[PDB]
Short mmCIF file of C-alpha atoms and ligand atoms in Angstrom, two decimals:
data_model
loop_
_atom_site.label_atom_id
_atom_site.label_comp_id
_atom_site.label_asym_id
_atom_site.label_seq_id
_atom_site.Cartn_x
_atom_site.Cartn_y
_atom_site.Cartn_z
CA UNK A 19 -9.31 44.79 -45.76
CA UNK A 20 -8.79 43.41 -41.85
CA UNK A 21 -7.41 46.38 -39.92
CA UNK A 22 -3.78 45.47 -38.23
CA UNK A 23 -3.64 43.46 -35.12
CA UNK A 24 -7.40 41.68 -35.60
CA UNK A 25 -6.47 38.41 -36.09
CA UNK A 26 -3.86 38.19 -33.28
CA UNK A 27 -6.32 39.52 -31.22
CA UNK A 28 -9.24 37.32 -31.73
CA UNK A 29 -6.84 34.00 -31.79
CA UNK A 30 -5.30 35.06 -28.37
CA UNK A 31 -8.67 35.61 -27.12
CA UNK A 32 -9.18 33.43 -24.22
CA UNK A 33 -11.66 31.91 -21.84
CA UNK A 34 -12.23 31.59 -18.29
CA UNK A 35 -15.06 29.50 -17.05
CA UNK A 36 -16.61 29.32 -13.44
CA UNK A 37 -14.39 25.97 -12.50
CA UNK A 38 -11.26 28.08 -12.91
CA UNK A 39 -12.03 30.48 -9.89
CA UNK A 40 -9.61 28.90 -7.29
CA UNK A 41 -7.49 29.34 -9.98
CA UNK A 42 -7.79 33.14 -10.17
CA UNK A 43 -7.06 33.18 -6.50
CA UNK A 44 -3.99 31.39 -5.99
CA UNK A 45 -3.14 34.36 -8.86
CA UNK A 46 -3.85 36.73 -6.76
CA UNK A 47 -2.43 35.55 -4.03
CA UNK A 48 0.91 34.95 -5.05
CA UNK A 49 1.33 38.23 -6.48
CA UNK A 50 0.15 40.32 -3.44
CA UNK A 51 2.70 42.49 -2.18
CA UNK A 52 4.82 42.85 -5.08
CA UNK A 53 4.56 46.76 -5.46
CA UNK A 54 3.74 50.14 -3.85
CA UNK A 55 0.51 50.06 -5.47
CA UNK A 56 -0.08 53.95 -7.39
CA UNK A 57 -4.18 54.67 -7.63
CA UNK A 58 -6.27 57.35 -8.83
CA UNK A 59 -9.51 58.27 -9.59
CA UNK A 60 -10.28 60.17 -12.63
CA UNK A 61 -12.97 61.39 -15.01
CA UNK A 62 -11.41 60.30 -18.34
CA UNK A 63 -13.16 57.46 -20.32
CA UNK A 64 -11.80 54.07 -19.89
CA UNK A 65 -9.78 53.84 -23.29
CA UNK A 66 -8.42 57.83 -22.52
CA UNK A 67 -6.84 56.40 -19.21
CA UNK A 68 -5.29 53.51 -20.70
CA UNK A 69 -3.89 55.47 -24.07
CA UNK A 70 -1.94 58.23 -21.43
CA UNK A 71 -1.04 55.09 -19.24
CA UNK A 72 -0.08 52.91 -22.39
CA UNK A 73 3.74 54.50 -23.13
CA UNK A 74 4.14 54.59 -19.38
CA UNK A 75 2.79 50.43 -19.36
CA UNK A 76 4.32 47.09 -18.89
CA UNK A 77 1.40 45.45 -19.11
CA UNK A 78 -1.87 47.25 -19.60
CA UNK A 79 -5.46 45.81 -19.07
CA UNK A 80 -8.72 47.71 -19.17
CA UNK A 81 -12.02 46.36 -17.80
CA UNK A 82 -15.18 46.28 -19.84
CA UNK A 83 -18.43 46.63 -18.38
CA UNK A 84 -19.93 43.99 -20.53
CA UNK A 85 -23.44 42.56 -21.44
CA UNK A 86 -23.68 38.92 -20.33
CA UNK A 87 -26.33 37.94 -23.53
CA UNK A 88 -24.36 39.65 -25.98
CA UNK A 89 -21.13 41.04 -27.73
CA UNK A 90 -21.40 44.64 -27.49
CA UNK A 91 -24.84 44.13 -25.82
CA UNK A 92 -26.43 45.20 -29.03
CA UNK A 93 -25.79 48.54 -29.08
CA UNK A 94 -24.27 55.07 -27.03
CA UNK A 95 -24.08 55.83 -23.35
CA UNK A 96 -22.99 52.73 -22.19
CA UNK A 97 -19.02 51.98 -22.01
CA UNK A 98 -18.69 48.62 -23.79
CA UNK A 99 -20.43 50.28 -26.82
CA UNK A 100 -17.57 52.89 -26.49
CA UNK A 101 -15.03 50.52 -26.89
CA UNK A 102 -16.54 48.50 -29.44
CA UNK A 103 -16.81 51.90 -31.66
CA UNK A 104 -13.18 52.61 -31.26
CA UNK A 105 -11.16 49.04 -30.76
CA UNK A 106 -10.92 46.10 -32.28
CA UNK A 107 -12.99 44.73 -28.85
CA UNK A 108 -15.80 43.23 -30.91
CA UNK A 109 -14.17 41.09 -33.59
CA UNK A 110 -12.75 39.90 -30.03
CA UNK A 111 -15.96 39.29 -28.60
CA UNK A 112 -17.81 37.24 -31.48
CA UNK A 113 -15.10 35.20 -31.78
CA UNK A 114 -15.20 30.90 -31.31
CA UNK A 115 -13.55 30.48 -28.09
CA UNK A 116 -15.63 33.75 -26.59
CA UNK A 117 -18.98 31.95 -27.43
CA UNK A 118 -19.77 29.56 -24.54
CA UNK A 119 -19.61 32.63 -21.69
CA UNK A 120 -22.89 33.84 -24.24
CA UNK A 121 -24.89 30.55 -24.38
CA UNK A 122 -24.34 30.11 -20.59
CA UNK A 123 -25.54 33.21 -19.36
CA UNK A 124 -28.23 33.37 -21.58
CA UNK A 125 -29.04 29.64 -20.41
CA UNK A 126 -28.76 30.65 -16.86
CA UNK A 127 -32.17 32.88 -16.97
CA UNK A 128 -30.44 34.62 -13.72
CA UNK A 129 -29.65 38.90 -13.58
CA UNK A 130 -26.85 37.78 -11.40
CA UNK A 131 -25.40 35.84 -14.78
CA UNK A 132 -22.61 33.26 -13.94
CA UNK A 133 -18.49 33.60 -13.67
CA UNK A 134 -17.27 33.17 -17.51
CA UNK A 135 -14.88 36.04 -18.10
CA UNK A 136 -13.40 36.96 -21.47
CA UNK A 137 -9.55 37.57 -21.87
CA UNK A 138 -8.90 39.58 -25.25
CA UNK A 139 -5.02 40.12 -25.30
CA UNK A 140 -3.45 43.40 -27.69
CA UNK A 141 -6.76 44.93 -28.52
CA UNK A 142 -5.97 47.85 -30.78
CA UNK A 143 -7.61 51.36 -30.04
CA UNK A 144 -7.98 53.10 -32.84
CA UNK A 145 -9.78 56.00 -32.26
CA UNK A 146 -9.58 58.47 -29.51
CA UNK A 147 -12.99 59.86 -27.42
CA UNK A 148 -13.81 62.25 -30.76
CA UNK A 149 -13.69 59.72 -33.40
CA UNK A 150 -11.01 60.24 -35.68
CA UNK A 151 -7.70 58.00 -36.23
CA UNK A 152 -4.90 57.50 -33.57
CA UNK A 153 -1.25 58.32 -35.28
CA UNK A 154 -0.98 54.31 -34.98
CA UNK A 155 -3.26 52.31 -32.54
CA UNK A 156 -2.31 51.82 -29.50
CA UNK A 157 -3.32 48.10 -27.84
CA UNK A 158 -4.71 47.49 -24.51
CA UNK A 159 -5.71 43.67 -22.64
CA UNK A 160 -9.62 43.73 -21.88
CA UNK A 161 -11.05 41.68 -19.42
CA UNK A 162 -14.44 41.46 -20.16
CA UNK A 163 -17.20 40.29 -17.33
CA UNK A 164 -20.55 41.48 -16.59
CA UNK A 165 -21.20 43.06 -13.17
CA UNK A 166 -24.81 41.44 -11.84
CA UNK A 167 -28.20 43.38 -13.21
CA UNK A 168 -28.76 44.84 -9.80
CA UNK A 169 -31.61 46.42 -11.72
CA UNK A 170 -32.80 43.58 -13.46
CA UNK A 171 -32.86 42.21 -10.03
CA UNK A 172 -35.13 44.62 -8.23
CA UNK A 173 -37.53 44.18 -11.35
CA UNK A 174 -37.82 41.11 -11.88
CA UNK A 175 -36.54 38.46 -9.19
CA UNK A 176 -36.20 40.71 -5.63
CA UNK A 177 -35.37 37.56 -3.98
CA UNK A 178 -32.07 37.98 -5.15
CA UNK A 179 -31.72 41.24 -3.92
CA UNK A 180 -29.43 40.03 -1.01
CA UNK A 181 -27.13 38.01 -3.30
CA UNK A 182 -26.55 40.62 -5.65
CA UNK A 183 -23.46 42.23 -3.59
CA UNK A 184 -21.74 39.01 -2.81
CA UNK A 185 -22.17 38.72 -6.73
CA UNK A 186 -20.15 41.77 -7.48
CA UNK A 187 -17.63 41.13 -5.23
CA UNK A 188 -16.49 37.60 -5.53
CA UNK A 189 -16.26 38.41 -9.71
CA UNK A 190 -14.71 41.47 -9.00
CA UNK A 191 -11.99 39.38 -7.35
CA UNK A 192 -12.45 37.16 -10.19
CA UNK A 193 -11.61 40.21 -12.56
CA UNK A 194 -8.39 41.18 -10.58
CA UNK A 195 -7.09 37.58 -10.41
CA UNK A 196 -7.86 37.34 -14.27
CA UNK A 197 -5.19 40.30 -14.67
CA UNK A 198 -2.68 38.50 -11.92
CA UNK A 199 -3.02 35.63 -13.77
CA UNK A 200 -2.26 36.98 -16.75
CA UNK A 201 0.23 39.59 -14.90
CA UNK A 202 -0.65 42.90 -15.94
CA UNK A 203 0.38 46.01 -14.06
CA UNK A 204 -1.49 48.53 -15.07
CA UNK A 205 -5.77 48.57 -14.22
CA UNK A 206 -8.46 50.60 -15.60
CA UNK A 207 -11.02 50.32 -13.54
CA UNK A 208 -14.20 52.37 -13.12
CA UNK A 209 -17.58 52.54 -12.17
CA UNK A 210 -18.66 48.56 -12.70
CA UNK A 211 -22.50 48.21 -12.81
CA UNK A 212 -23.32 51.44 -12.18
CA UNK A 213 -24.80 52.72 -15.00
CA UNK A 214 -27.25 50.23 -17.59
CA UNK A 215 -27.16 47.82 -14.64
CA UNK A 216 -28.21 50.30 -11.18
CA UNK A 217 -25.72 48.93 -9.00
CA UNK A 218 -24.86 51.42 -6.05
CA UNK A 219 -21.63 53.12 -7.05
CA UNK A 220 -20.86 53.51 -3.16
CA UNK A 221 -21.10 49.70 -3.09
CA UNK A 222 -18.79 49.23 -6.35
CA UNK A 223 -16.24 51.77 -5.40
CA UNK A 224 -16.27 50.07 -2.15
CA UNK A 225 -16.12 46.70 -2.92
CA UNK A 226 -12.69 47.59 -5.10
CA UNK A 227 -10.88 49.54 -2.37
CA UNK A 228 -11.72 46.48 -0.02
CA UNK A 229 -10.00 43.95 -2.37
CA UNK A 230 -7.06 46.29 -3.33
CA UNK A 231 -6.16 46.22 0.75
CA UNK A 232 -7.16 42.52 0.96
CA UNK A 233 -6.76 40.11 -1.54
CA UNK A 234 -5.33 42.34 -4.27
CA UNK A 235 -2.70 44.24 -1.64
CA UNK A 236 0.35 44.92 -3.76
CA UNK A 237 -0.66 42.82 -6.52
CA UNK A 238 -0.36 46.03 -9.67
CA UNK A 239 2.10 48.59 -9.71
CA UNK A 240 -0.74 51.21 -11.19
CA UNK A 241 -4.41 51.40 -10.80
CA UNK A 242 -6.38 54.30 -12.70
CA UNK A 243 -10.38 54.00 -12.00
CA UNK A 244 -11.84 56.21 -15.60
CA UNK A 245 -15.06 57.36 -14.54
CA UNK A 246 -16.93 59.19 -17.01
CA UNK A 247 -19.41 61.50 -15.57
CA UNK A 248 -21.38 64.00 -17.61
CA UNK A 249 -24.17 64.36 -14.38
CA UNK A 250 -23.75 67.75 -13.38
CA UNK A 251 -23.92 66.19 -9.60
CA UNK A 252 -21.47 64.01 -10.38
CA UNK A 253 -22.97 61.27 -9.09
CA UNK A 254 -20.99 58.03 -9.71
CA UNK A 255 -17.47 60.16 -10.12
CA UNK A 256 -18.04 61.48 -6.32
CA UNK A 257 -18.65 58.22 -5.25
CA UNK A 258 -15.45 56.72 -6.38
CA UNK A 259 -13.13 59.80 -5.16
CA UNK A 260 -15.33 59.70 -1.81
CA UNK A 261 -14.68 56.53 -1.18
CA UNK A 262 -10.96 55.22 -2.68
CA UNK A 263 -9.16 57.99 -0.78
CA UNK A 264 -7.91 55.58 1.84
CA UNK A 265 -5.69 53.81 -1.12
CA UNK A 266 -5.25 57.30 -3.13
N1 AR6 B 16 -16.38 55.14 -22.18
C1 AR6 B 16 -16.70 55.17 -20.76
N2 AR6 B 16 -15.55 55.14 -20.12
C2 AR6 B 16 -15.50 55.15 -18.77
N3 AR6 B 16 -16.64 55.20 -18.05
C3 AR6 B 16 -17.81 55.24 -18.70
C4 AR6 B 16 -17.86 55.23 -20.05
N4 AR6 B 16 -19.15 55.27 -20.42
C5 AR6 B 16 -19.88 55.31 -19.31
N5 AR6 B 16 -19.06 55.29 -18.24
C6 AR6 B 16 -19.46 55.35 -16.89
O1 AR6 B 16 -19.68 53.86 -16.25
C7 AR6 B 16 -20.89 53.81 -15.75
C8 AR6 B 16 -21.47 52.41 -16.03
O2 AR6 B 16 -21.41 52.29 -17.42
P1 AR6 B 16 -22.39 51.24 -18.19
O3 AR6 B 16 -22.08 51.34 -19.65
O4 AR6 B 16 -23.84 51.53 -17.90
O5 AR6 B 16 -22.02 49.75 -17.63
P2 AR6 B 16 -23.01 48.90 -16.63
O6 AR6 B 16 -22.17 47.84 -15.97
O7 AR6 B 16 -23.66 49.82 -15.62
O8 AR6 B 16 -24.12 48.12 -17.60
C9 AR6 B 16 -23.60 47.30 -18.63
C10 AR6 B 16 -24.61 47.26 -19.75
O9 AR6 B 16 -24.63 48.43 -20.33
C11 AR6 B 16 -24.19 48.19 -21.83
O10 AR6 B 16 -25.21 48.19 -22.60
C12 AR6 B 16 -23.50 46.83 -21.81
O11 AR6 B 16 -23.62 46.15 -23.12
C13 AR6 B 16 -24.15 46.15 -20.86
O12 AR6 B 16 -25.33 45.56 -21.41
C14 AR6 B 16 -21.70 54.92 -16.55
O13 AR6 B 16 -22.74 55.40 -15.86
C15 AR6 B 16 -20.63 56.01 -16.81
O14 AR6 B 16 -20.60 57.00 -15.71
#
């Protein structure tokens, strides 16, 4: 049998194409400025910082740091597999609507991908980080977009090394005008690109705390960046403390 809160979840689950970007803007821009805007950085995984943040939540959305080419990306240590083995996330991801931002990015023979987004509303967690039930699940809003293969890039088409940052950052503000559009306060964010995908975690980290003093200024009452970091240097999770403690 279907486990609870599938079927709403994948018939809710919602598009947004490249041609709705000004859209995503004018979002954002008419809901900066409408809090004192709490942030932290921690080390939880993404679906442990929104199940703590989920009783304290008006509206909670968690980003997932997704494969362009395919649901899950095919499948251990990556974080979109995580959420796919404890959340409904992937009956989300196969479903109708969901397909096109597939079939363009794999027609778009670019690493940089293009600026489809997926909106799955009340995804149900249903497992915590060890693997057994929750007492009831527990939903969470993912927006689903994949940062640009940096590594990809340097591998295979260096000419758009240069265009790889201005790739991160305008669907980053893409991501956050997704959630103003569809007003959530509460953000998990985290460490975008880094992993799979190379991208500099200064640059990521960065490229955030620019847009949540910019664009984004105001626009969520809490945002939590989960960065799960097993590296005894700690790597990516210094990174992200180093460099968001202007904001936290
Ligand atoms: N559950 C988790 N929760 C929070 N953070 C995590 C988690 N797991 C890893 N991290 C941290 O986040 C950092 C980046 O996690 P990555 O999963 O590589 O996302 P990407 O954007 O770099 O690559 C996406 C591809 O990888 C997949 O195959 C997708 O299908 C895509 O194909 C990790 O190093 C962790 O420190």
């Amino acid at each position: 049998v279907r486990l609870p809160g599938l079927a709403a979840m994948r018939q809710g689950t919602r598009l947004f194409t490249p041609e709705q970007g000004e859209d995503l803007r004018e979002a954002l821009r008419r809901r900066r400025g409408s809090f004192q805007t709490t942030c932290e950085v921690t080390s939880e995984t993404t679906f442990a910082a929104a199940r703590r943040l989920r009783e304290k939540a008006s509206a909670l959305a968690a980003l997932n740091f997704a494969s362009a080419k395919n649901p899950g990306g095919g499948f251990a240590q990556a974080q979109e597999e995580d959420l796919c083995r404890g959340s409904g996330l992937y009956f989300s991801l196969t479903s109708p609507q969901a397909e096109p931002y597939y079939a363009v990015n794999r027609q778009s023979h670019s690493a940089l991908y293009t600026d489809h987004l997926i909106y799955s509303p009340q995804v149900p967690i249903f497992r915590d980080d060890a693997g057994q039930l929750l007492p009831a699940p527990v939903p969470v809003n993912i927006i689903t977009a994949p940062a640009p293969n940096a590594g990809a890039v340097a591998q295979s088409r260096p000419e758009q090394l240069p265009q790889v940052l201005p790739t991160l950052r305008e669907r980053a503000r893409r991501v956050l005008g997704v959630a103003a559009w569809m007003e959530q306060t509460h953000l998990v964010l985290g460490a975008w690109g880094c992993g799979v995908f190379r991208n500099d975690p200064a640059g990521v980290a960065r490229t955030f705390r620019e847009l949540l003093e910019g664009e984004a200024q105001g626009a969520f009452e809490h945002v939590t960046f989960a960065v799960l970091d097993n590296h005894p240097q700690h790597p990516k999770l210094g990174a992200f403390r180093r460099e968001l403690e202007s904001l936290c």
